[PDB]
Every structure is written in structure tokens, then in C-alpha cells.
Design a protein around this ligand. Sequence first.
Ligand SMILES: *[C@]1(C(=O)N[C@H](C(=O)N2CCC[C@H]2C(=O)OC)[C@@H](C)CC)O[C@@H]1C(=O)NCCC
Length: 251
Amino acid sequence: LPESFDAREQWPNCPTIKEIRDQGSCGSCWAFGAVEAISDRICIHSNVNVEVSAEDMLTCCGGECGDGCNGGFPSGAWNFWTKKGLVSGGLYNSHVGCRPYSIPPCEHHVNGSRPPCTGEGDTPKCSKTCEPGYSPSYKEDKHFGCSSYSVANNEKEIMAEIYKNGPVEGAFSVYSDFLLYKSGVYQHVSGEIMGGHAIRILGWGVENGTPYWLVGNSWNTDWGDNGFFKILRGQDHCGIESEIVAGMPCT
Ligand SMILES: *[C@]1(C(=O)N[C@H](C(=O)N2CCC[C@H]2C(=O)OC)[C@@H](C)CC)O[C@@H]1C(=O)NCCC
């Protein structure tokens, strides 16, 4: 395996890999890490480009994935993709796809022009219909996964999975010092625990002798490094290597 790897550069024909979304004032990271990676993989293994609906995942999976805006289970999300499939749907107010995200973007621990985020956000309804004007129907717009699996807590295996099949979803413990991340390789040194956070791992590298994972967060582009961040790799730091999940699209 190479010393560094950036899925954005390796798969130029898949622009979703470079995208950063905004989960808004809702604990839907579990859903975002999943639909983002799934969007990437649909493109990688179908060379079609689809903005997979975070809304569909968040609202219609149900108990199998956890508790909507109150948190969820990454592996459960990929299961939903293989069982019920996912329709398309872009950013809030984009009118792109069957079910665009319904929760407004906000400022995640940074100052900006958008309203500040509020942890208080209710899970939107599961509506099996597409926005007006969109075709085909909800049922016909479903994209299915044909496998859902969990990658072992093994650096090399995780790198191999990304190298061959594309970005994966992962999760780690977020402490307050992570909230102010701006650059460099993140390593937890202080701060109260905020909770578990699901994200998208799209590569790896070494910065100043420090091995890291290239990760895309779902807190918009003005947080961190243009929406992305790097975290220590190889020591299951904050559990970053302990909950890796992925899957392959049908056909
Ligand atoms: C993962 C999750 O969404 N985490 C939270 C979060 O990202 N936000 C909620 C409101 C807007 C976000 C923010 O800006 O937080 C600062 C927080 C708690 C993480 C830092 O609860 C979700 C998950 O599904 N839980 C289980 C772990 C996989």
C-alpha cells in the first residue's frame, strides 16, 4: 500500500468524494457518514453519479438504525441501503433529487453568516414521496446496496478496503478539543466527552512524521479544514479504527 492515498485524486470522475455536507441541528452523523460514502461507492462501482438522500436514511430507516436525530448505528445504515435502498436527494433547499435534506445548514462551533447550530432538532417524517417535479417515483428512485459489512479494527485492512473499494464510514469519540480543530493531525489531549461521532474516511497520509486518516466531517465547509480533518492513524485513537463499516452497490 502507498504511503498516502486521497480518494478525491484517485477517482476524479466522482465529485461527491470531494463534497462536504451539513447535518444541521440534528444528531444525524450516522446517516451522513453512510450516505456520503455510499454516494462515492455508487460512482466508483458504476462507471452513474447519485447524491444519496441523507433525508431518506435519517427518516425512514427507523429502529434498525437507532434513533434518528438522537443518534444511530452506522452498520444499521448500510443495512438499510441493502434492504430498502436509498433514493436521491441533495443539500437543503437545493431541490436536487427525490428527497433533499430538510434541516437547514448552520454554524458548527464557528462564527459565520448562518444561524448557530442548536443541538435541539427533531427527526423529520419518513415520507415515501419525491419533491414536486422530480421523476421517477420514490420507489423507482431507490438505489440498493448488495452487501453490508464491518471492517476489522486493523489499520492495514482498513487502508486496503479504502484503496480498493472507496471511502468508508467510521466513528470516534469526540472530546471538546476536537470542536475547535483547524489544521494538522488531531490528537485528543483535553476536554469533556461530547459523544460518539460518525464520519467518512477517504484516505490517509503522513504529516510531519505523524500518520493520519483523511476524514470528511458533516459540519459544512467553514468548520475545520474546509470541512475536512486529519486524525492520528495506527493507534485506534479515540476509537477511529474500531467501528469501520462499508458495503458494495448492486450491479
Ligand atoms: C453523531 C452526531 O451527529 N454527533 C453530534 C453532532 O455532530 N452534532 C449534533 C448537532 C450538530 C452537530 C455539532 O455541531 O456537534 C458539535 C455531536 C454530539 C458530536 C460531536 O450522535 C450521532 C451518532 O449517531 N451517535 C452514535 C455514534 C455513532
